[PDB]
DNA sequence: CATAGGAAAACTGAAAGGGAGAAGTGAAAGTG
DNA sequence: CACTTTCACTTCTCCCTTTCAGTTTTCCTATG
């Protein structure tokens, strides 16, 4: 099925409802707020799949093909943040990215 | 009954005021505005009504086609001596419209 | 009706009235266009020279009727060249610190 | 929002920051005092950008020094010409516009 | 212990930059 | 006539990405 580029919010809601990425989850019964893992790239404990969502999105649009392009976790993170930053209907609700243990951010759908 | 002519039909729809944003724009009623929102806009007239008046569109029978309604309306108006396009505000993000004037 | 952008361009290159808008070969088929990034702290009106000249040619921009919108000028100049048979972008140096420009060729 | 280098030439030409000076004639070389403060042009910068508002914020002179050294670090056409931050007497560093 | 200092590189918001491609246009052929 | 469609273009909206110009974090060693 000749897919059009998915749009970031519809796509991401998928990822939330389906729960297949570790630490990317709805955080409440009403499915209104959600968490995103958000570890800093200079951290020594950091890997690839630390930040799956950023990579996942770079791949959902065709921007990064594993093995064709050089991996660039900084660029993925910044594209994702950037895309969501433009979205009426969405806000950054809680920045816990400097946490030494479960660094993440919480976002919240806001009804128009 | 026969086909309406665009100019008297147009005048009649401006008079009746049943179409939102379609209105005389001065006191002497020789200038007027037509809503002119660009079709690629999510939030997306008289264009349709003229398609309905002329038999070019029947709801049910036809697939809607705002682009062709707008194009036909515009080209029909371009031809008319005695009517000029006075102002193009079709890009404005709040009330995209154009302003015509009956002249002679 | 709107001018076509490619004949207007040759005309503009020949007149040679815009800084860094030039033929860069003898046969006049290769030309350069300045392309500095708007966000650069040394940017102004004539950093968008052919872009404005083009918005004025098509009547989009009337200095005094309209407010400058250089991203839109640049947007529409680039869009008008965007997939044009007969022109290709030979070289993107819009990123150069020194003289950001792009090189285009007639094909 | 002020740009660091135009801003810095403007602090140097104005000469009203203790120990921050043109050290040259062609005005292309300059000093900035660099004491290991462990018991100001760095705060000047932090206030100029809104990073620090005295009263709203906890004073943080190491961060201010950090942000200021890191900004200058990124500018092409500025060079650290002499590091005398480890001189016992007048701890300072010398930069040079190139 | 404690904090301050460094360079390198990751990070950030705001705004410019980009591309795809549907829809926009006037002039003039076409339609009955 | 009296519009409607075709042709040969340009440009606009959607919907993100990337640059700009610093700013922070990391992971350390030095200093107090």
DSSP annotation string for C3-28: PPHHHHHHHHHHH--STT-EE-STTS
Residue B1 burial (CB count, 10 A): 3
**What whole-number distance in Å separates Cα of residue B42 and Cα of residue A59?**
27
CA B35 from centroid of its chain's CA atoms: 7
- CB D23: neighbour CB atoms within 10 A? 16
Does at least one atom of strand F sit less than 7 Å from the CB of A73?
A: no
* CA of residue B35 to C1' of nucleotide E10, angstroms: 49
Q: List protein-proximal bases of chain E (any atom < 7 A from a CB).
A: 3-29
The alpha carbon of residue A73 and the mean position of all alpha carbons in its chain are separated, in whole angstroms, by: 12
- Asked whether strand F has any atom less than 7 Å from the CB of D44, the reply is no
Determine if strand F comes within 7 Å of the CB of B18.
no
Joined tokens for residue B91: 């890009």
Q: How far is the CA of D56 from the C1' of E24 (A)?
A: 53
Closest residue by Cα to residue D82 from D90, D92, D74, D71: D92
Structure token pair of residue B44: 């997306």
State how far the alpha carbon of B87 is from the alpha carbons of B33, B54, C64, in Å.
9, 27, 16
| Smallest CA–C1' distance to F3, residue | B76
Question: Please, what's the largest Cα pairwise distance for chain B?
Answer: 41
Strand order in the sheet with C22-23: C22-23, C30-34, C101-106, C87-93
Within window 6-35 on D, which residues have Cβ closer than 7 Å to strand F? none
Q: Which two tokens stand for residue D54?
A: 């005295």
Establish whether the CB of A96 is closer than 7 Å to any nucleic acid atom in strand E.
no
Within residues 15-34 of protein chain D, the ones with CB less than 7 A from nucleic strand E are: 34
Q: Which chains touch D (3 or more CB pairs under 8 A)?
A: none
What is A56-94 written as a DSSP string?
A: HHHHHTTS--BTTB---HHHHHHHHHHHHHT-TTEEEEE
Q: From the alpha carbon of B40, which nucleotide's C1' atom is closest?
A: F13
Beta bridge partners of D97: D78
Is the CB atom of residue C11 positioned under 7 angstroms from any atom of strand F? no
Give yes or no for CB of B38 within 7 Å of strand E.
yes
Give the closest nucleotide to C4 (alpha carbon vs C1'): F9
HSE-CB at C79 with a 13 A cutoff on CA atoms is 8
The answer to whether A69 and A49 have CB atoms below 8 angstroms apart is no
Residue nearest to nucleotide F24 (CA to C1'): D67
Q: Is B41 exposed, middle or buried (0-12, 13-18, 19+ CB in 10 A)?
A: exposed
Angle at the Cα of B13 (from B7 to B18), degrees rounded to 5?
Answer: 165
Experimental resolution (Å): 2.3
**C6 contact to strand F (CB, 7 A limit):** yes
CA-wise closest residue to A106 among A6, A38, A42: A38
To which residue do tokens 């350069």 refer? C32
Rg (CA), chain C: 13
- Cα–Cα distance for residue pair C1/B82, rounded to 1 Å: 20
The torsion of the CA quartet A84, A87, A89, A94, rounded to 10 degrees, works out to 40
Smallest Cα–Cα separation from B7: which of B99, B89, B73, B88?
Answer: B73
Query: What residues contact residue C81 under an 8 Å CB cut-off, 6+ apart?
Result: C5, C87, C89, C104
Q: Cα–Cα distance between D47 and C10 in angstroms, integer? A: 51
Long-range contacts of A22-30 (CB under 8 A, 24+ apart): A22/A52, A23/A102, A23/A104, A24/A52, A24/A53, A27/A106
Which bases on strand F have an atom closer than 7 Å to a protein beta carbon? 2-6, 9-28, 31-32
Question: What's the CA angle centered on C78, arms C77 and C83, to 5 degrees?
Answer: 120
Chains in contact with chain A (at least 3 beta-carbon pairs closer than 8 A): none
**What are the distances in angstroms from CA D9 to CA A107, D14, D66, D67?**
43, 8, 20, 18
Q: Which domains does chain C have, with CATH numbers?
A: 4-107 (1.10.10.10)
Residue A48's Cβ-count burial label (10 Å; 0-12, 13-18, 19+) is: exposed
Give the Cβ contact number of residue A22 at 10 Å: 11
> Is C67's CB less than 7 Å from nucleic acid strand E?
no
How many C-beta neighbours within 10 Å does residue A85 have? Answer: 10
């Amino acid at each position: 099925m000749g897919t059009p580029k998915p749009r970031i919010l519809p796509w991401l809601v998928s990822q939330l409802d389906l729960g297949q990425l570790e630490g990317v989850a709805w955080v409440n019964k009403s499915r209104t707020r959600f968490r995103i893992p958000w570890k800093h790239g200079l951290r020594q404990d950091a890997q690839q799949e630390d930040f799956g969502i950023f990579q996942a999105w770079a791949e959902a649009t065709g921007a990064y093909v594993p093995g064709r392009d050089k991996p660039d976790l900084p660029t993925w993170k910044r594209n994702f943040r950037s895309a969501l930053n433009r979205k009426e209907g969405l806000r950054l609700a809680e920045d816990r990215s400097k946490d030494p243990h479960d660094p993440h951010k919480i976002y919240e759908f806001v009804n128009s």
